[PDB]
Amino acid sequence: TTSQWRELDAAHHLHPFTDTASLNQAGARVMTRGEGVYLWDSEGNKIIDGMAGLWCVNVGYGRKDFAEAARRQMEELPFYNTFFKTTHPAVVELSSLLAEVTPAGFDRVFYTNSGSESVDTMIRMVRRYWDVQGKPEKKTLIGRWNGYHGSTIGGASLGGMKYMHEQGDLPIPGMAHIEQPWWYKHGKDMTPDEFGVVAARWLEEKILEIGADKVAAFVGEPIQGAGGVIVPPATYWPEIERICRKYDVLLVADEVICGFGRTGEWFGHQHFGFQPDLFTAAKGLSSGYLPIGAVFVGKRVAEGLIAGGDFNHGFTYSGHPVCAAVAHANVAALRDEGIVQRVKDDIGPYMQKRWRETFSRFEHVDDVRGVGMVQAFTLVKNKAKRELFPDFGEIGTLCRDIFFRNNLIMRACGDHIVSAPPLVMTRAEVDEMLAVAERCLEEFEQTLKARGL
Amino acid sequence: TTSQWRELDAAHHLHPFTDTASLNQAGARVMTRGEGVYLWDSEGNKIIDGMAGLWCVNVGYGRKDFAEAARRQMEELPFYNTFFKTTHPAVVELSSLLAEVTPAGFDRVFYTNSGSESVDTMIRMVRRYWDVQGKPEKKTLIGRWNGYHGSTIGGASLGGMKYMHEQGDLPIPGMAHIEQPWWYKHGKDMTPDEFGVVAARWLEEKILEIGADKVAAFVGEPIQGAGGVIVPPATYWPEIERICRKYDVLLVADEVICGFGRTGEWFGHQHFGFQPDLFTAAKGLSSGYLPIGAVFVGKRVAEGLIAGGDFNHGFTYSGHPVCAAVAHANVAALRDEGIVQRVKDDIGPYMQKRWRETFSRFEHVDDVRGVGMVQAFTLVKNKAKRELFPDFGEIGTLCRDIFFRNNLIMRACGDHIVSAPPLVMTRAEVDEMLAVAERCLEEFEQTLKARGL
Ligand SMILES: Cc1ncc(COP(=O)(O)O)c(CN)c1O
Ligand SMILES: Cc1ncc(COP(=O)(O)O)c(CN)c1O
């Protein structure tokens, strides 16, 4: 029963990013089944999954073909390691397919179990690369305040969430942070395009404050996900790239979210028009059907790692055959069923138009934004004056609770509301989701006013 | 073909703990199928897997029931996150079953994708614990030289492999290391039991040097795996535990290898008779059939973490439903099919007797050792003098290459040779494996002499 599952969960399970005592007193929501864009819970609610699991179930729920690929691989060879001068066909075939869907010059992939492990891999690869170049001082990686790069000690350090830094005595050494390109807060009297150049040049100013000979890499999500779908101006990434090339700093895209079609390009960096030296992946790589991540290593960094002999790094389940077989089915479906192309040409433009049509009218909604199948808005105290609520996050929590009670999953990141539904969502699904979201915002506005805004 | 698979692997795949240029020149061995204790490669060789994948395929290859459990869960609900005050039946049922097979006082489990992530989780938990206790200086974790705790930045820093420290600028702060309890090298004129007390007192020396008020935890593998199946004396772990309790230091077992039956007990700390405050797991948790790890949190540390409110840590695939369903089937089989009990009562004692009967006679083999279904020996230049070969690892590589050419997988850790076969191996299989190993060592002794070493 719901009761028994909640009691066992409270007794035995510690959840990610959770206040355990609060969750155990409230009761966990038990999700039992998924099909297309929908979920069911243990109380029989049918739920619109406007978050695709956690930005990751890109082909939607219910792929029986993926379950068959897993079953077949698991019966033949459930596991073999890639440590003993050994490989297996599933990881070879996935590596070959991944070279076809990635840009030219990304031939070589290193596998992990998660986006967090891909980020730690990338940190060790970047530092190893500069050692092989004979630059042992070039070790600092620069991230952003409100960037998210996972939950390993490495990834939490590179990320810019102070609430994670405060648990574990982070960041570790050789990590620095610049402000995020959040125009609504930091744009002063500028247009987004003017601001994009200013926000990019924060990187150059930080490189010069530290010393360029000490800086290994700049790492960024093309769009900041957990930070609230912070979509940088069009001028931002070309300027970041120019600054990285000027100082001989590696450029790293964290594609764990934007990867595998979320923007309508295969990768977020293709949408924003920059060319990273390496990029990190997970999530959409297998649509979340099994845990797998990757680091895609460009030609320059690959040659440096190869010139360095032993790379003393990796995970038991790196290249796991069952995970590789499911990822292969998933990437083959994204390409061969035209799912990525449909985001670029059809459902992305429709979602973006309908999202702006739906939210733009609300008194306490501003900065309506998105690309492809990631979109967001911010809850604001005064739209005219672009004033935010104090205690950023309290009002976002009120709004997300209304969504959840109405069987719609959209997440609050502070007072940002975000959505990243399965890429296969139909136009009709998009309209159904926006109709429920619109009713939830009307209730939100009524509640604000009733309670004294 | 073998040729086509090797060419694609060389072009596209970066392997864990590998010299890529050397592997791509040699050609990777392509493993295609597994059954019981055996593997087949792309050239049709049948191979005895004396390493159970990578110390992890505890129930052996060919569990069609596990593939069915994976298929069924993947069709129903392939993924849902445990972040949104959400849970799902598979992770609840696994959490309940794990409380039944773990010692009393380990009710609460935190899920990861890997042993490395479990170690990073444990480091952030132990630091968070001491913050909640109001001891914010108590942050240093102590490990051992030649200890292995994974390949995240955190796990590589806590581990004691200098060849990992040198790639990534590790260890991170708040990490210290003591010498390993390796009697053959460090025991001088002591008995093993005398040496166990001296080697444990190295921990006391390190605590007093740092200051107990700055030390959060001591972390150790019950038996050092990747370091070469370093089996400590019987006096070691009781003395470690006495020292940790004296100085108010948490005691952490890394059970990633010893866990899930490898010693004949469910966990290595039960064999060696110490009670850790937390322990890390992966590998045998799912017999490697899908990626999953865990941190088992004892009552005292669990209460501290719960009293701390939000724990700002976790992974997208934490508690992954498909991985949890397979882990559940695996743990149920270990208990209900009597597999762990059989290691303790039957196959463990048989292996340990036959291992000692097989190797003890060879002129350049010494320190023949093991417990349950993990066993090892050291290749030595002169047994009388306990003189090791120079360039520790070169002679182990020669010996491992003979095994691999004879379709037997045993791993070299420097000049240690180690074995950890599936726990379901039959007595007959054990004799088959030992007969091949014996012939390989005869060849090894002939090759040593032929080459003047
Ligand atoms: C941009 C980014 N990078 C890294 C990670 C970490 O991935 P994982 O949770 O699979 O460890 C995430 C997870 N949301 C992410 O969004
Ligand atoms: C004791 C120990 N701890 C942690 C790890 C890391 O586990 P993983 O490779 O699954 O990240 C290993 C891996 N062999 C290990 O042997």
Numbering used by the authors:
A (entry chain B), B (entry chain A): 6 to 458
Extract from the study:
One of the main factors limiting the implementation of transaminases on an industrial scale for the synthesis of chiral amines is their poor storage and operational stability. In the present paper we have described and validated a possible inactivation model for the well-characterized homodimeric (S)-selective amine transaminase from Chromobacterium violaceum. Computational and experimental studies show that the stabilization role of PLP is exerted primarily at the level of the catalytic lysine K288 and secondarily at the level of the PGBC.
The cryo-protection of single holo-Cv-ATA protein crystals in the presence of the amino donor 1-(S)-phenylethylamine (20 mM) led to the conversion of PLP to PMP in cristallo without producing any visible crystal cracking (Supplementary). The final refined structure model (Supplementary) contains two homodimers per asymmetric unit, reciprocally oriented according to the same weak translational pseudo-symmetry described for the holo-form of the enzyme and each showing the same overall backbone folding. The clear discontinuity in the electron density between the cofactor ring and the K288 side chain (Supplementary) justified the modeling of the cofactor moiety as PMP in all chains with 100% occupancy. In agreement with what has been observed for other PLP-dependent enzymes, the conversion of PLP to PMP is associated with a small combined tilt and twist reorientation of the cofactor ring hinged on its pyridine nitrogen (Supplementary). The PMP·Cv-ATA structure shows that, upon breakage of the K288-PLP Schiff base linkage, neither K288 nor the other variability regions rearrange to their apo-conformation on the seconds time scale of cryoprotection. Since the actual reaction turnover is expected to be orders of magnitude faster, it can be concluded that these structural rearrangements do not occur during the catalytic cycle and must be the outcome of a different process. The newly solved PMP·Cv-ATA crystal complex confirmed that none of the known conformational rearrangements occur on the second time scale of crystal cryoprotection and, by extension, during the much faster time scale of catalytic turnover. Recently Börner et al. reported that Cv-ATA incubation in the presence of an amine substrate results in enzyme de-stabilization and explained this observation with the possible diffusion of the non-covalently bound PMP away from the active site. This is in agreement with our model, as the conversion of PLP to PMP releases the K288 from the Schiff base constraint and enables the K288 reorientation to the backward conformation.
